[PDB]
Amino acid sequence: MNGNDPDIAGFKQQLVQMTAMRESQPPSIEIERQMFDAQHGAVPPAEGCLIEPISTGGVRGERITPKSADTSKALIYFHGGGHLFGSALSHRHLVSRLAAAAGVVAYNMEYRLAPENPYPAGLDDAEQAYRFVLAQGFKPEDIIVAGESAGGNLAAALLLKLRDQDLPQPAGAYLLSPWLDMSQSGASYEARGPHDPMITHNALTGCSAAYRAGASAEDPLISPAKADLADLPSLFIQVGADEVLLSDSVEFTRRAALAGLDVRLHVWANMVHAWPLFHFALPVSGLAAIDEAGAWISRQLG
Amino acid sequence: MNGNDPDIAGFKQQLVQMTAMRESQPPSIEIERQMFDAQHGAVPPAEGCLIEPISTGGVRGERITPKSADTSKALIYFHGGGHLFGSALSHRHLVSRLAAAAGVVAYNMEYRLAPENPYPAGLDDAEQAYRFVLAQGFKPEDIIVAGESAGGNLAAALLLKLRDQDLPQPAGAYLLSPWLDMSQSGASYEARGPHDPMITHNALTGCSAAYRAGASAEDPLISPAKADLADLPSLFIQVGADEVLLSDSVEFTRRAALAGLDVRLHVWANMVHAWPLFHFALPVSGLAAIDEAGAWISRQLG
Amino acid sequence: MNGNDPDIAGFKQQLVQMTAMRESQPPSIEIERQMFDAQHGAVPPAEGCLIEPISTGGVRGERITPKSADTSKALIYFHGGGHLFGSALSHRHLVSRLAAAAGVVAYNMEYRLAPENPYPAGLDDAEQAYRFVLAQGFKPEDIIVAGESAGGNLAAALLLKLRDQDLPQPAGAYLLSPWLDMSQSGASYEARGPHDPMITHNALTGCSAAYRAGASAEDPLISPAKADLADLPSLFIQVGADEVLLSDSVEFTRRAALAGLDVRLHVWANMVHAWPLFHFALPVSGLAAIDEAGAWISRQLG
Amino acid sequence: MNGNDPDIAGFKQQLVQMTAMRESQPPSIEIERQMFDAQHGAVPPAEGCLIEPISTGGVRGERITPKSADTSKALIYFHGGGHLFGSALSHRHLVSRLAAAAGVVAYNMEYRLAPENPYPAGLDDAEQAYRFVLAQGFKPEDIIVAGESAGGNLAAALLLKLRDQDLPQPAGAYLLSPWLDMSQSGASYEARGPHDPMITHNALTGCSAAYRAGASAEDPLISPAKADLADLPSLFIQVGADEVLLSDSVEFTRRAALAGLDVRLHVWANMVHAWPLFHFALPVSGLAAIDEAGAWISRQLG
Structure with missing residues (x-):
């Protein structure tokens, strides 16, 4: 209420205990995929959307049509999950x-x-x-x-x-x-x-090794903050201040700017990693961030 | 989508058949209260709100606090229901x-x-x-x-x-x-x-009789569109164009204007009675009207 | 400042004295056209617009292009002036x-x-x-x-x-x-x-007689608030509460609504006739009303 | 029009020739102050504002009150000008x-x-x-x-x-x-x-020497992008992509983020240095950026 997030403090402590558990006991990948799907799949979708599955030529996902939307305009979204888990469903x-x-x-x-x-x-x-x-x-x-x-x-x-x-x-x-x-x-x-409280150097190290499978971290296609960003399109980056991954956002911004690109970066004070994905726990900062992103996506598509 | 309401045509037909049923077979009050509570009580509340019951000194209802809201500002809402039914729950x-x-x-x-x-x-x-x-x-x-x-x-x-x-x-x-x-x-x-399709002359006639219990329809406290509106506050009125009650909105507007009040009247084309209450069936026009109303209420208490 | 218009009270008194003068001494039409053009033509245009005169086949006016505008979208504006005065220039x-x-x-x-x-x-x-x-x-x-x-x-x-x-x-x-x-x-x-303070029954009577030149006031093409408004497009009407012409706005609204049209009516408390035209004297209510109208025009053209 | 800035191309060329002149012929300080005052002092202020001079206890400037503004909220703005020129007037x-x-x-x-x-x-x-x-x-x-x-x-x-x-x-x-x-x-x-086209390395080197008068460039109070930003407030930074000073904005952003601050950075494609100060030449990008900045300042003091 009144401009402060009444849930962040509580959610951070839940994350601290959660991280302490996963640090001490590194669980099954196939197991964490189900539990991830289970938790997130149980979150109600946005009101008023039609969802159609896609399954054609090994291309798989879902078309989400908000009934108010402009159907000539498209957001292509890729879930996160360390390249280990997550899905359309989640x-x-x-x-x-x-x-x-x-x-x-x-x-x-x-x-x-x-x-x-x-x-x-x-x-x-x-x-x-x-x-x-x-x-x-x-x-x-x-x-x-x-x-x-x-x-x-x-x-x-x-x-x-x-x-x-x-x-x-x-x-x-x-x-x-x-x-x-x-x-x-x-x-x-x-x-x-x-x-x-959510993302550790150790976790990323592990996600990175599994993803690259001996491919070099120096490859720009693996590590985009190592690319020259000449001729990329306009960018909007949201990141939380309370994130080990903060530096990657700022660096990509630096490079985008240096390449001459339109780039907007919003670093949110007090926010944990991908906090909008956690809107069900963080309705103040999470929904407000979804609105910020929504407004940029809308402005950007004309 | 694309400026249009894809659900109003279908919702109107549902209302036609619904009204035809209730016209032919005038149902119990106590029964229609339950059925009304059951349908509307099942609609999920707005995401991210805290709801506390109220029951003291014969005042009964609910405080709804959106977690992002300003707690020093308040909307007092009275459900409709023909003075026969409806509740906080609904x-x-x-x-x-x-x-x-x-x-x-x-x-x-x-x-x-x-x-x-x-x-x-x-x-x-x-x-x-x-x-x-x-x-x-x-x-x-x-x-x-x-x-x-x-x-x-x-x-x-x-x-x-x-x-x-x-x-x-x-x-x-x-x-x-x-x-x-x-x-x-x-x-x-x-x-x-x-x-x-939703509101008949005959239904209101009945609801009016039961509310008045012999009191005159001419009394301004019963029929506010019969009052002199001197010194009332600013007004925002939303009404649908496809409503028998349209004239009441326009008349109250007329009177408000004549008393010198700030008055905003939005007549929505194609919209049926209290269409925002039916946002679950009408996500395009219903949510858009809730947003319009929300924007006015916010600007008004700003 | 702070939600009140600091100029309306002063501007109203200027209007009172002005009206008292014009009531006592009904001036030349050709003279009032020049003085109208002179006062209004001296008001700076909106910043950042390109203005091109139009003069082809007895069609005359000006294309105004805001440099930010969408050039596939057009507002056609007709000045007022009682059908006696006013111009593109003014x-x-x-x-x-x-x-x-x-x-x-x-x-x-x-x-x-x-x-x-x-x-x-x-x-x-x-x-x-x-x-x-x-x-x-x-x-x-x-x-x-x-x-x-x-x-x-x-x-x-x-x-x-x-x-x-x-x-x-x-x-x-x-x-x-x-x-x-x-x-x-x-x-x-x-x-x-x-x-x-601005518009009197007597003034309108005179403007009306000159315009109609014996044509009947009952003709809907002369008096649109006497028409059936079936099949007209969406409407936005702004009027001030402090206007003899208030009733015409409310009646047109009534008729538009009754014909089933999308109609928005905003009656502004304390506002005199065509107050946005007087934004140079009334920057608070005048510019805010131009913004309201601008936002509806924009929404309406998609 | 239509999303594009029709004036930046032309304004950039004017700046190229302007810079080429000042590079070849480094003009008087006292002369450039007058010429700067003369050009910018001639630009009409925002419509509907009251301006009062200030001159007491060595504090000098202007209170600008927009007639619609909230008088309990304040923006304190310091002109630029390389610490060599500029004024309230400009x-x-x-x-x-x-x-x-x-x-x-x-x-x-x-x-x-x-x-x-x-x-x-x-x-x-x-x-x-x-x-x-x-x-x-x-x-x-x-x-x-x-x-x-x-x-x-x-x-x-x-x-x-x-x-x-x-x-x-x-x-x-x-x-x-x-x-x-x-x-x-x-x-x-x-x-x-x-x-x-507007800001050279050489010009800043000169402006820096004159400001420092032997003081070190390393001093954080002289070079804020060399400071630790712990406990500063929320930041909004606008900078153009076509600016030698771009890196200073990105670095301050980096530091703000690292200190945990809320920081919004908008890098505008194609925009030259302090382009909103040049809104008279750049009405599309300049006014749009003033509006962006205005929206942030309002949200921030809201």
Whole structure:
């Protein structure tokens, strides 16, 4: 109430205890996928949306249509989950909310996960997801690509992939707490680490090794904050101040700016990693951030 | 989608058949209260709100606090229901959404119903409800008073009661499809009646008899569209174009204007009676109207 | 400051003295046209607009392009002035502001005036102005027509003219203090007359006789508040509470609503006739009203 | 029009030739102050504002009151001008527009300039200015502190001075193209320098020498992008992508984030240095940025 988030303090402590448990006892991947799906799949979608599954040519996900939306405009969202877990199902509750806020159709897309499918399996999928969307008759200018953490990793990598293949860029990209350096470098590990109850250096190290499967962390397609960002589209990045991954957002911003790009960065005080995904626990900062992102997505698509 | 309401056509047909059933077979009061509670009580409240019951000094209802709201500002809402049915429980889903959109606390207040408690029992309750809120340490200029149909009836009569008792007015009133003439007069019965699938002349005639219990329809406290509106506060009125009650809204507007009041009237094309209460069936027009109303209530207490 | 208009009280007194002078001494028409042009033409246009004169086939006015505008969207504005005075030049300062607020191109159009050119000279011009605009490649759905007082008279008449000629309607019409009953009827003459410092029954009587030149006041094309408004487009009407012409706005609203139309009416407390035209004296209520109108024009054109 | 800035291309060319002239022929300080005052003093202030001079206890400037503003909320703005030139008079046109957009009172404050008054004369003034405003009975959380380039330098140093003197911070700071590193370091000198038509490395080097008068560039109070930003308030920074000073904005952002601050950074594609100060040449991007900044300042003091 009244401009403060009454839930963040409580949610942070829940995260502290939760992290202490996962640090002491590193659980099954297949097990954490189910429990992730179970928790998140149980969160009600945005009101008033039609959801249609997609399953054609190994391209898989869901079209989310807010009934108020402009159906000529598309958000392509890739869930996060360290490239280990997450799905369309789990992120439906967030992507639907972002769609309804932006007044656009969302493509809530799946992609192959590590350890079973290391780099470049995910990224090939993301490119195929993007081709799928273009093939529905959306022009590049009618697309924002997005994702949080690992999905943020894919979203940013896709743009680099499109540049390499000399292909036109979407209208923009929305990155939420994106993970853009799979070598875990930045002032924020040390500086924000005591304030980050959710994400540890150790966790990312492990997610990174499984994803790369010996591929170098220095590869820009793996670590987008190591790329030259010349000719990428407009960017909106949301990150929390209380995040080891803070530095990746600021660095990508630096590079985007240096490449001459329109780039907006909002670092939210007191916010933990991908806090909008946690709107069910954090309705004040989480919904307000979904509205901020929604408004940029909407402005960006014209 | 795309500016259009894809559900109103279908919802109107459901209402036609519904009305045809209730016209042919006039059901029990006690039965229709339960069925009304059951359907509307099942609609999820606005996300992220805290709801506390109220039951002291014959004042009964619910405080709804949106977690983002300003706790020093208050909406007092009276459900409609022809003064025969409806409750806090039934209207929770609407009043919560209105509160969340307005960024204010809602008092979702009960009042005694006809035929058991004819006029002036409900209005005595509404005044009690108003005093109760003031007693929580809200000043008059921190209150919007509100309600749809019969609730709109009470809201608007409350203002008249406050004027009679030479009391400060709230900062405004929000009226949704208010029923302001309990004699069922107006061009709209004939002009809009073939387009109104939900509200008949005959149903209101009946609801009016039960509420009045022999009291005159001419009495301004029963029929606010028969009052002189000198010194009332700012008004926002939403009403649908496809409503027998349309003329009551336009007349109250006329009178408000003639008394020199700030008055905003939005007649929504194609909209049926209290369509925002039906946001679960009408997500496009219903949520958009809740947002409109929310924006006004916020600007009004800003 | 702080939600009150610090200029209205002063401006009202200036109007009282001004009206007392014009009542005692009815001046030259040709003289009042120059002095009207002189005062209003001296008001700076909205910042950042390109203005191009139009002079082709007796169609005359100005294209106002806000540099931020969407050039596929058009406002057609007809100045008021009792059908005796006013011009593109005089209303440029208002129409430019409305254009810039709405983000659309404005066609600020001239039309022949009484006494030299009584009805239907003006209205023939308004229709030709509208044809001119369509011929620039604007579709009907990309047009709002508008005007204040007498311009409000023309705007509303044009819509009736389009219906008669079985021609498609524009997307909407914006009417500011429109004068829609050239017989001077309504509760507001008596009820608002002591509060209206600018517009008198006598003035309108005189403007009406010159315009009609024996044509009947009962003709709907002369008095749009006497028409059946079936099949007109969406409406936004702004009027002040302190206006003898208040009743015309409320009646047109009533009729629009009764015909099933989307109609928005905002009656502003304390506001005098066409107060947005007086934004140079009334920057609080005048600019805020231009923003309200701008936002509706923008929403209406998609 | 249509999303595009039709004037930036032309304005950039004017800046190229302007810079080429001043590079070849380095003009008088006293002369450039007059020419700067003459050009900018001629730009009309925001419509509807009251401006009062201030000259007491060595504090000098202007109170700008937008007639619609909230008089309990205040923006303190320091003009830029390389700490060599600029004045209240020159920046009136921008600060008035910012105030009018934000709905707050502006303190448009002077400060002593180099070479006559080197560091710390300006900063002593800025602190004086701040105290003066507090003394008008504004609380810290009713103040945004602001300035562009050199003004941004002072604004951001003021916050550091307030921290040193263990004083309450204002509610936020708005920095436009701030000059935060007076050693002229950053990737952007090389990366953005061919795209910056307005600001050269050489000009800043000179402005830095005159301001420092032998003081070290390393001093945080001179170079805020060298400070630790612990406990500063919320930040909004606008900077253009085509600016040698881009890196200073990104670095201050980095530091703010690392100190845990709420920080919003908007890098505008194609925009030259302090482009909102050039709204008279750049109405599309300049007014849109004033509105963005205004919206933030309003939300911040809301």
